[PDB]
Subunit: 298 residues, 6 copies
């Protein structure tokens, strides 16, 4: 299936500038050439126009920083992703902070009866305005997509929820707020924190994840936050948490997913060149995309 790349130079979902440079850092890391090498019909649709943050004293949003601009940008993204899916192409979204997942899922979910989601991240991203200790929307996209949060976020695309909790699988988590633990626990979301990765090993984690989703969904969206990997492997991220997934574990995960052929849409987020070491993180992302799309060692 042909691929369409959509860049979303968004950094309004959090406070550290630079993640808006993530899409082009990945383009410069060679994403197009990497995928073309695999014989793909790859198209780069450019970037979604993002707004400027309105003055703090003006718009109401501290538990929901930059709400209107984040919501607006996500509406455009949803529309663009929806168009790509309708054209029979695979939407590959490059961020940009994780709040863009709201738009990506909005444009994709409507096309599936039961869309599954693999949230590869050091965090749960299941906060709401009420539980968020920072007010950063990039920590709320999963909750919002499940229909929990501000209507400006949950209603993007004109429908809600995008997915069901039983169709989500979190992988690599090692930093959850108490409210998020409660959310995950109560909604019954499947989760493999670093404890399970260490205890069962990435192979088993992926086998169980793949079997779990293939058994109850008709499509699977991969939402990969580079901070899921250890900061030593992916230093250019805004919210690094030590004790993460290795470069090799991540390649294995992508290779196993490619093998399973269950991934119908994907997004690589949180790449911040401004906090990186010589584009290492963008390069890691591109290498992972390579494996995801079928690149094999043999």
């Amino acid at each position: 299936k042909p691929i369409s790349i959509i860049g979303v130079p968004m950094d309004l979902g959090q406070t550290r500038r630079g993640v808006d440079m993530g899409p082009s850092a990945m383009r410069y890391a060679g994403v197009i050439e990497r995928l073309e090498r695999l014989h793909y019909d790859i198209e780069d649709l450019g970037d979604i126009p993002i707004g400027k943050a309105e003055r703090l004293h003006e718009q109401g949003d501290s538990r929901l920083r930059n709400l209107k601009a984040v919501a607006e940008a996500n509406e455009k993204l949803a529309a663009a992703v929806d168009q790509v899916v309708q054209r029979g192409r695979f939407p590959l979204v490059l961020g940009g902070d994780h709040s863009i997942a709201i738009g990506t899922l909005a444009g994709v979910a409507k096309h599936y009866e039961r869309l599954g989601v693999i949230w590869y991240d050091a965090h749960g991203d299941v906060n709401t305005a009420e539980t968020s200790p920072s007010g950063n929307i990039h920590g709320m996209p999963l909750a919002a997509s499940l229909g929990f949060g501000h209507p400006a976020l949950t209603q993007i695309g004109g429908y809600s929820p995008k997915i069901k909790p039983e169709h989500v699988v979190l992988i690599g988590v090692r930093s959850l707020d108490e409210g998020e633990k409660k959310f995950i626990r109560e909604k019954g979301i499947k989760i493999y924190t670093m404890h399970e990765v260490d205890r069962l090993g990435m192979t088993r984690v992926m086998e169980e994840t793949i079997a779990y989703l293939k058994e109850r969904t008709d499509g699977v969206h991969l939402s990969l936050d580079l901070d899921g990997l250890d900061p030593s492997d992916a230093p250019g991220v805004g919210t690094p948490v030590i004790g993460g997934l290795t470069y090799r574990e991540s390649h294995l995960a992508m290779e196993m997913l490619a093998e399973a052929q269950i991934i119908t849409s994907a997004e690589f987020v949180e790449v911040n060149p401004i906090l990186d070491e010589r584009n290492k993180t963008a390069s890691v992302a591109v290498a992972l995309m390579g494996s995801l799309f079928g690149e094999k060692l043999m």
Copy 2:
């Protein structure tokens, strides 16, 4: 069970100065705050007064550096740990070089019929005055506690031995003198060197260790030397040995011990700020203590 922290600013069990700063480095790394967050009744009893080393020519002997000061400090430590145990609290000892294990075990062992011991370290610490190539008492605590060594060390607390060889499990070993290998072999001490960790994996090493001990002891003491971890994860130690346990493997080990609920006493030793990189080692020790006491990712 409430916890009582006892600091032992000891560096006389070896020759590199700075390990005496280990108790406060860990305090500054936030040990109290970490454990309070877990809803523990945590008490900091301060530090054991350590004497100044007596001139080697006057001390016990060339093969036992700083014998009297090490012994005296361990007597006071045993007394303190004994009182904590009698108060129904969990004794958490912060070192300080490994020679303090003699006092910790002296204060705890008397309270159990069959005390087990998990010696997490890159070394076996089973040397005696006769086998020691250095005379550093921090390389003799396990042997002394088993009743093998100078009476000044074996008799601490007024009884001997503190534990039996069949109730000890060494984990992470990768540096043993030939005499130590002989001691371990002859005493029949259970041991998982890095070979077994790599071959079986940390999950299996821990499962076997827990089952082995739970099956024959009525209490288990964890004696953790930060040099058990690889120097890249725990650089601030006096005797680093490459090819060590990772940060993740260590957290898994602590989480599995916490889950088993077999740990009745613990000590974190060999933290030397003076050989460290921005208190990294003390911070690792605190994070590990967090996991040991029940901290979970989910």
Copy 3:
């Protein structure tokens, strides 16, 4: 005098992608806030729209890579800089590779009888299509501004030359092609290579430079290439050359220029976040701009 910032996200003057991220990396390093702190009336005019490189097989340009797009972008820049000067404001241009100097000087020079230029760089940038060993236009802006080069470059702004050789001063040079040495020698351009900096010291270099220019010009443009500084201080540059100017020498230079009050326009170029270490180079640039605009330690 009020300042107007113009970003030029240009990387077509050379081959390493990422320098087009230089303007926003500097904005994120806090350039606006830094200058506002000094009580300046600072305005950010945004970025000059830059084109996409046409296919190699199509347009004639190997000794002059991306000529049309570089020329086009520079025409727009010249127009924008000209407007700013006409409004009585100081034009502060952020790059972007050094080829943008062609547009900056085109927009500025026409307003002065004898515009001087301080070219702070590890290179001379005096190549022509005939002498360039790479065909990269970012190594030709000084020659082009002096009226030597392709008419598409020398005629930007509708006039030529922008400045005279006797009004230019190169500082920090340590990498010149033989043709460039000949050019500098023959045109009689004043130059302080690292040999003179080491031998005379930065204080003398600047005193002589300031006295030389103040004595024969009615305005001075500072064209600062971050690669003028040593790669250890400014690692995020496309053409690093060891044995460069120190962070302190650069601050001294900027402070002395600020003191002399001879700088009437400036541009900071070659910042490439993609080759940098956590925005260090953009940060250095901002600190230097701070000193240039009057920031003092006392």
Copy 4:
């Protein structure tokens, strides 16, 4: 003249824990051995007992954090330094944050008609309870010693002021609050910021300093804050400021001071092992002490 070392394990003058480990990190860096090698009669008087800070909520002034304990400890230090000077010995004080300079100067100043002061630091430390943006007393010792500040600090030792503004020379300054610049300007304190060091060179700065003081004082106290050196040379400090004095410049300054024979008392402060790289900063301090006391390359 024999030397008496007094350690002051103080960290209450600021908020980063660890600087209280500075005295012993320097002892472990070999300060006694270094000085004995120079044929000095050296005596280590131990450490000044420092009190624990009382609960912030029940404190007297937020603009003066830990006032009582800082003042208390400084009184003891003043008495100790006073004793040493009365015995005809040179007081060498090891810190500890810079707030200890209040006690050192209190113990020394009473013994001289016109005591001079060389404040080698990246900061001025001339804030008061009214001007301080933090309430950290380590940012107030120079002002307090000149008689400006809270009486609890200015009256230590039972007299004030300790020194006159015309007898102070600041060297290496690169971080001053606006209030501090005003203070320095108005009191007429001689100051060589990094601008002057870069412009004039360390040799000239030192010749002028020595000549200025030798001409109007009968004793000179050296108060050296390790943060005066660049963070690359002295990383273990709580308030690092880039663009600092080099290792070599610092040795030159100490060697020129030794040559002049004007230093009658000294203190090395702000060494924080917990923020350091394998005791590098403590080692630098010890090497500088060596030079100060006469160690020569030839």
Copy 5:
């Protein structure tokens, strides 16, 4: 079985100078001492004289750089290894680039009915003069030894092939040209790329390898290219490929090989001190040799 060390200071099989320093870097890393400590009768036969490459312009085949000198040196190596095996000693060959494997195998293979080969490398080294994208013979030794390639290489020692494809096992592969994948696929060579190592784990990879070979061979040659390990563990190599085998995995593999007692000859190649970090790679090679020859942690 006594060991005979033969150094081959060869760098002609590739283009990066320095790998010819590999034999002595390993000697300086203490290879003799390491093995003697294990009670081995160890003999160092010195280095094979390597000829100088003749001028490229006057060479016979561009697809086979330095053919004559590589072949010449490999003939001498084959004769030397042959001699060692005839004396009943174990030939331990130190390189030198991988092209020396042609001589090592030529000298050993004639002595076994069915010689097995474990090729521990990031690459397959199965290119020929026709498939090679570089003409570097170090990328052709495995193919040549199997009888595929230029007769100058396949006929070394006067016979061919040295081994059968069904008796070779590639371990750690992560960089194969398309021609090489085709070669491996078509010849039916057993291969464990990094995908299999990650998926199955090193223990399983080694158990399968040992069982596979032990079942069909009467001797096994270990050809270990240090680039098989991750560049972070073995930086001093000419063709580094990220995502490699860890230090620990390599020790485990060597220890399991030692345990199986199947290795009858070995070579450690591609160590380049000139591209290394303080002899780290040579040291790794020596530690691995220690494990291979029986060194145990307990």
Copy 6:
């Protein structure tokens, strides 16, 4: 004047292996290409055959390690350098530890009435068998060449002494034994330690050195030990000493010597690849040689 390069792969003058790899490390760093680029008639005569160290118990004595092999190698070196000089060529010797200076000076001195010497090093190298704390001959070459030391070293070439004390200038010294300071003081050898470099600056040090020598010699030999530079610039050396000469200071020194045209012979010693970071030190040596032989920035 044409140049003849002679390599001396010597490491017997000290105890750290690897310095014998220095001649080829510099060759690989491109020494021939660098000098050819300057239009020199450059000839590489190869390496001097160095014997293997004789058992210390049989050699000269405990105070002169490897005496006979060092002496024999220096005899051959003197003969080779002598022939080069007779052929009217400039002898450029690449080491190899500093003990080779004995042979170099032996081959050159006989050809001059009053040969001068610039000893660029962190050390004085003026120890004798009696004063040497190690017995390493690389710490005795300057003294031996002045006729002070074991006759096996002082008589090399059949004459003694090679140079007079008043014709020697030491530059960059910062590590002298007390006996060496006494030797330098008593023999009246001109010396610029790091104190004078910092106080006067490298320009003045060089101007005085050149004028001093030009005024009393008819030829000048440059004996450059890479340890003269700071370990951060030249890490690959056996005896590093912090607080050294910078990369820039060294280039200035070479450029000024080139400009003066007083250097008639030269040697670059102590380069140890095995203690280096990717041949950085050999590369520094080559760049310095470039400057020495006339390479100019402009």
